[PDB]
């Protein structure tokens, strides 16, 4: 960001054309490239979205809810965010959106098997359509977001079917595809803190106990930026991740510390211990019944799967940017959910985890 | 004058019939009207050098100092006649019956500061004549006289 | 055809279509100025990919609805006279010396004359 | 009229060693409401923080001459006291006034566009 | 119980030829000039030591004092009876970048009793205080605010002064001479910050200047005199 | 002329060090304008074709009216600038 992203006003894509940026770098500028993010309405994309729009970057951004792509508009001037409407089932609609598109970044990603779609279909089949498509329209440069633990051969489906997404886009893509994998992210609303900040968290020990690398979905958005910008960074494999180790059962303890959440813990149901077949039950149950995205037996499986760092695949650094930790901004984001308030700054993070490990 | 004036000289719509007598009767003032203007008369047809310049001829912009301030009283007037030069020490020696003809008016009375309209003069007026609020409503009416 | 969309031209070789979506006008093909850019290449952008060519303005061109109005004439006078034709809603009047021997256009209408010799000699 | 909280009268010093006085006593007001700062516009940095930017503000300007312009800046800088303790200013603004902000060489600066 | 007429029936006067008087307007001041020249000169008399000089276009007269003499004076228009001025309705300021004193700043008054105005206009400079009019009259507290806002005009004495008319924050003081029109930041809503932050100012159409074709030539000259012959060498 | 009065007029740092300042002369009076940037001073808009601009003092011209005076404000303000002498 700070004034200018782009490295050199002139840009050649691997397409030939010759893209000149203008102005110095503000919402009236510009910079000749077509971005168009997928999944843009997602968690992921109104950051992606966001950093691309404002430096002057054309974003078309296919929705297939029409009331949450109002408010993606307003971070570019006039014309520079475009909207089609489309489904994955649309081909058509797919190359709506790919025609003038200098820039493509694929961010779909289910964990959550609907009526309508299942894991592979969308971590794979919206993926190798969204990747080929792009490719018979001359698109310069793909990016994509998988899962941070790509296995082709896991037991948990989301794992199986990201790495297999990985696949599938180079025998369609080719070798100028991208892949990124992105260690859970927290920002605001973030899916991966919104399961530690709710109150009622049936089998919370169970769920609590896998291991992560917390990232920052501020650089994480950045990231994409850098990539964007630059051909020297096609074919690779990118894993994202934080240098200090966290796990959900530490951060939980050290999220509820926070809010200051005697007796209300073992009555509120901050724990619920119950038996692995009625975890195993009761997710299944709501997949019949239930009409919103709940838990799922997927994440039943992750939760016994720690993550695991690949060492084929290259850091932030290799990009020039240092991966910035989980203490110096976890209590800001759940500063909306906690006299004299007490922030709890960078190395205070460490004392606070300090009281949650003594017993 | 604005007197009471009644219904059937507004241009508003009006009663036709018995119910102009119901009406008469019912309402507390009969010569108001609905308000609801005359569809047949209200808006029926819609609407489908130099002997004359003065601006070159503005008044001009002199300013007056104490220098040109003092010449007033020594020298006279151009009408009637009679650097920097300072006008304290020509105040400090100086015949007053200047001051009484020149510097003030009317044997050294001080000028009433200039009305910017003479003709502003008031009268105090009564109930009868501007059909205004009684007397124990806590305002007066006042005019041009 | 890739060549005349793009250049400016007096007339168009081709038989302009009504129903054609990448001409510059209804009327006409090529654009009437050197510096208008194509309308080939303006509807090639990014926000024309879902919304509809049939509906956007296209209005006919104003350089075919003159010519084919038929020159006026002058007799037996070397002065011409216009004012827009239309009474006092029109352009202010101009007079027009017909001394040069061919069609000579109106100020502001567009309108051209001649004299009542030069008829023949000018028509050809 | 009844002027408002934490009001001062607009007086035009004429010594040089008075105004020293006032600038001190009006730094440790800033440095008093080090807490409540932090707790009126919910900043995410702590009071320590707050003091350290605070300090970087009036350390940074300590060397100016001119008694005219001394008590200008004097005046302007009890505005600033006055915006903030009354809580004047929106939560925005003091968010974005901590934080605002090493070059580049001329290859760099060339090729971008330079300024 | 008589039908109403309809106006557009009613027989209405013809008019032909027109003669619009056309002479010049300065003739009905002819005696209101020639009345605020002696009261100008009274307060010069009353006053020697602050009245630097005055000047009256037409039904308007003014008063030019300097910074130290400007109380001085604005008390003597306030309570000596032969001028009792007693409402001040407006402290403006203008901006001369040339003159050393660039701003003027200006006092109207309103005579309610004597019915007539009078304008005080003492210079400042972008350092030099002015005495505030405060202890006469409470009026100019929001008047004097609107000037230090939109001047930087050094106001002494003021019980409070400090921004009324600009952002919170805000920097620099708009209506001079070398603030730009568009001012230097503009404002917009950040995702990411999740607030609305200030930002530097672009344009999508930069503000186009026209003056580049203005008049070459004089438009107007001295004009002709009114002035009162009493008030001449 | 030695006063900073630059810490009171509310100016960006930009112009104080970035701008330089034309004093010139159209033909009785002095005028003040800056220098146009280097680059983004005018680039067009894709949109539309609007002439866009980054520089804030593009539209800003000061009428002064005797040539000492115009120097005094620049010295005042502590505006980098130059003079053009009209031909005779
Ligand atoms: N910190 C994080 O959030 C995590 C990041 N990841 C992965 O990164 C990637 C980014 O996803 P993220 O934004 O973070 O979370 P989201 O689940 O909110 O992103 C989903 C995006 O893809 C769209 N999507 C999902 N299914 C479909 C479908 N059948 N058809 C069309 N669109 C669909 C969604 O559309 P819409 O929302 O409009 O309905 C939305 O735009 C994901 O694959 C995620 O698994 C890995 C672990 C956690
Ligand atoms: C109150 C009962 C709610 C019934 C929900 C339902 O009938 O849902 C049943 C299934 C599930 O589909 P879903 O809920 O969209 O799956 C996504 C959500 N998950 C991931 C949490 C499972 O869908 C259907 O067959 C819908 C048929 C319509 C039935 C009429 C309503
Ligand atoms: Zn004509």
Redesign the interface.
């Known amino acids: 960001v700070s004034t200018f992203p782009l490295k050199s006003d002139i840009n050649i894509t691997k397409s030939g054309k010759t893209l000149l940026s203008?102005?110095?770098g503000?919402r009236?500028?510009?910079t000749?490239f077509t971005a168009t993010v997928f999944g843009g309405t997602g968690f992921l994309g109104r950051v992606v979205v966001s950093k691309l729009a404002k430096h002057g970057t054309n974003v078309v951004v296919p929705f297939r809810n029409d009331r949450a792509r109002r408010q993606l508009k307003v971070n570019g001037?006039?014309?520079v965010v475009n909207f089609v409407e489309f489904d994955i089932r649309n081909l058509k609609s797919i190359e709506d959106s790919v025609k003038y598109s200098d820039i493509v970044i694929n961010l779909i990603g289910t964990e959550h098997f609907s009526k309508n779609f299942s894991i592979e279909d969308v971590n794979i089949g919206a993926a190798e359509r969204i990747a080929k498509a792009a490719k018979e329209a001359g698109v310069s440069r793909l990016i994509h977001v998988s899962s941070y633990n790509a296995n082709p051969s896991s037991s948990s489906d989301f794992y199986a079917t990201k790495g297999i997404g990985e696949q599938v886009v180079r025998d369609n893509f080719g070798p100028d595809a991208t892949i990124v994998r992105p260690a859970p992210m927290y920002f605001r609303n973030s899916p991966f803190l919104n399961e530690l900040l709710q109150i009622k968290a049936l089998g919370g020990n169970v769920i609590f106990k896998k291991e992560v690398y917390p990232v920052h979905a501020l650089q994480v958005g950045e990231a994409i930026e850098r990539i964007a910008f630059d051909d020297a960074t096609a074919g690779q494999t990118y894993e994202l991740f934080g240098k200090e180790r966290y796990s959900k059962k530490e951060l939980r303890e050290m999220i509820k510390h926070i809010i200051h959440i005697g007796y209300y813990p073992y009555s509120a149901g901050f724990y619920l211990p119950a038996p692995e077949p009625f975890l195993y039950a009761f997710a299944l149950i709501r997949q019949y019944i239930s009409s919103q995205p709940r838990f799922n037996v997927d994440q039943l499986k992750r939760s016994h799967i720690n993550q695991e760092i690949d060492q084929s695949a290259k850091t932030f650094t290799d990009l020039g940017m240092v991966p910035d930790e989980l203490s110096e901004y976890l209590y800001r984001y759940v500063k909306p959910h906690i006299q004299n308030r007490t922030v709890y700054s960078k190395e205070d993070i460490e004392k606070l985890r300090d009281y949650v490990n003594t017993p | 004058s604005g007197g009471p004036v009644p219904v059937f000289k507004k241009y508003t719509t009006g009663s036709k019939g018995i119910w102009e007598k119901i009406r008469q009767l019912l309402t507390l003032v009969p010569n108001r009207s609905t308000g609801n203007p005359l569809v047949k008369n209200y808006r029926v047809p819609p609407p489908g050098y130099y002997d004359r310049d003065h601006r070159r001829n503005y008044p001009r912009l002199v300013a007056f100092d104490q220098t040109k301030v003092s010449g007033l009283l020594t020298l006279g007037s151009a009408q009637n006649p009679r650097q920097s030069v300072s006008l304290s020490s020509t105040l400090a020696t100086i015949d007053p019956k200047v001051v009484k003809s020149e510097l003030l008016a009317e044997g050294g009375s001080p000028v009433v500061a200039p009305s910017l309209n003479k003709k502003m003069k008031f009268r105090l007026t009564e109930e009868s004549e501007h059909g205004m609020y009684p007397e124990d409503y806590p305002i007066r009416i006042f005019a041009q006289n | 055809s890739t060549k005349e969309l793009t250049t400016a031209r007096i007339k168009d070789i081709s038989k302009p279509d009504e129903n054609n979506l990448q001409q510059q006008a209804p009327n006409r093909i090529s654009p009437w100025s050197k510096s208008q850019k194509p309308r080939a290449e303006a509807q090639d952008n990014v926000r024309f990919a879902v919304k509809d060519l049939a509906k956007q303005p296209r209005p006919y061109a104003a350089i075919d609805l003159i010519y084919k109005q038929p020159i006026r004439y002058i007799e037996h006078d070397n002065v011409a006279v216009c004012d827009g034709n239309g009474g006092a809603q029109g352009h202010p009047k101009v007079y027009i010396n017909l001394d040069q021997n061919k069609a000579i256009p109106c100020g502001y209408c567009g309108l051209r004359f001649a004299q009542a010799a030069f008829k023949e000699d000018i028509e050809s | 009229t009844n002027p408002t909280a934490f009001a001062q009268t607009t007086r035009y010093v004429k010594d040089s060693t008075e105004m020293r006085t006032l600038v001190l006593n009006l730094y440790r007001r800033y440095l008093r409401h080090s807490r409540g700062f932090v707790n009126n516009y919910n900043l995410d940095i702590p009071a320590s923080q707050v003091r350290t930017k605070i300090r970087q503000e009036f350390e940074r300007?300590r060397f100016?001459?001119?008694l005219?312009?001394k008590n200008?800046?004097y005046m302007?800088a009890q505005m600033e006291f006055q915006e903030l303790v009354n809580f004047w200013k929106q939560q925005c603004h003091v968010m974005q006034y901590f934080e605002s902000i090493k070059g580049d060489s001329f290859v760099q600066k060339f090729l971008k566009?330079?300024? | 119980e008589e039908p109403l007429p309809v106006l557009r029936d009613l027989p209405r006067p013809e008019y032909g030829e027109l003669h619009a008087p056309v002479y010049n307007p300065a003739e009905k001041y002819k005696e209101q000039i020639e009345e605020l020249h002696k009261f100008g000169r009274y307060i010069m008399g009353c006053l020697p030591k602050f009245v630097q000089q005055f000047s009256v276009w037409k039904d308007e007269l003014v008063i030019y004092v300097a910074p130290s003499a400007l109380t001085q004076v604005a008390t003597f228009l306030k309570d000596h009876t032969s001028a009792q001025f007693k409402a001040c309705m407006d402290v403006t300021a203008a901006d001369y970048?040339?003159?050393?004193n660039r701003f003027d700043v200006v006092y109207n008054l309103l005579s309610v009793r004597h019915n007539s105005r009078i304008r005080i206009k003492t210079y400042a400079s972008?350092?030099s205080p002015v005495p505030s009019v405060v202890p006469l009259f409470q009026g100019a507290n929001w008047f004097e605010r609107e000037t230090y806002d939109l001047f930087?005009i050094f106001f002494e004495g003021h019980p409070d002064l400090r921004r009324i008319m600009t952002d919170y924050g805000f920097?620099?003081?708009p209506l001079?001479?070398?603030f730009?029109?568009?001012?230097?930041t503009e404002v917009r809503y950040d995702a990411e910050k999740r607030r609305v932050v200030y930002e530097?100012?672009?344009?999508?159409?930069?503000?186009?200047?026209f003056?580049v074709g203005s008049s070459?030539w004089e438009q107007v000259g001295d004009g002709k005199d009114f002035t009162p012959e009493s008030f001449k060498l | 002329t030695?006063?900073?009065?630059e810490?009171?007029?509310?100016?960006?740092k930009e112009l104080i060090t970035?701008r330089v300042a034309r004093i010139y002369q159209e033909?009785e009076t002095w005028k003040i304008d800056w220098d146009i940037?280097?680059?983004?001073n005018?680039?067009?808009?894709?949109?539309m074709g609007?002439?866009?601009?980054?520089?804030?003092?593009?539209?800003?011209?000061?009428k002064?009216?005797?040539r000492e005076?115009?120097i005094?404000?620049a010295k005042?303000?502590g505006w980098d600038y130059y003079i053009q002498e009209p031909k005779v």
Do not use: C
């Open positions: 203008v102005g110095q503000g009236s500028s510009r000749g001037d006039l014309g | 300007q100016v001459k001119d005219p312009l200008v800046l302007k566009g330079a300024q | 970048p040339t003159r050393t972008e350092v930087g920097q620099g003081h001079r001479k070398d730009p029109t568009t001012g230097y530097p100012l672009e344009l999508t159409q930069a503000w186009r200047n003056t070459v | 030695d006063l900073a009065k810490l009171v007029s509310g100016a960006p970035e033909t940037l280097n680059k983004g005018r680039w067009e808009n894709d949109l609007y002439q866009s601009s980054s520089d804030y003092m593009q539209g800003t011209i000061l002064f009216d005797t005076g115009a005094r404000f005042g303000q």
